[PDB]
Amino acid sequence: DILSRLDPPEAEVQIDRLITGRLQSLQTYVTQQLIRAAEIRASANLAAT
Amino acid sequence: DILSRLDPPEAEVQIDRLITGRLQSLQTYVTQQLIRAAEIRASANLAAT
């Protein structure tokens, strides 16, 4: 709908905002999965011992 | 190249787009190093034991 109702020069501006938000969300997700996996690893290490 | 084919009022807008990206990339580098150092630290703590 963003494009469907506009030219390229005018749509690229909005699509870059959408891209910025959606990339920020994915970085937040991946950083928290990295922090949460190091906590699961310390627990599996205790289980092995 | 932005300081050679743009006047100062137009080169600010183009320099800020680079500043934002490079800051993002540097800060991603610094987060992943904290997460990797916290893992090297536990290995060295096991080696000391």
From Swiss-Prot, chains A, B:
<comment type="function">
    <text>Subunit of the fusion protein that is processed upon entry into the host cell. Mediates fusion of the virion and cellular membranes by functioning as a class I viral fusion protein. Contains a viral fusion peptide that is unmasked after S2 cleavage. This cleavage can occur at the cell membrane by host TMPRSS2 or during endocytosis by host CSTL. In either case, this triggers an extensive and irreversible conformational change that leads to fusion of the viral envelope with the cellular cytoplasmic membrane, releasing viral genomic RNA into the host cell cytoplasm.</text>
</comment>
<protein>
    <recommendedName>
        <fullName>Spike protein S2'</fullName>
    </recommendedName>
</protein>
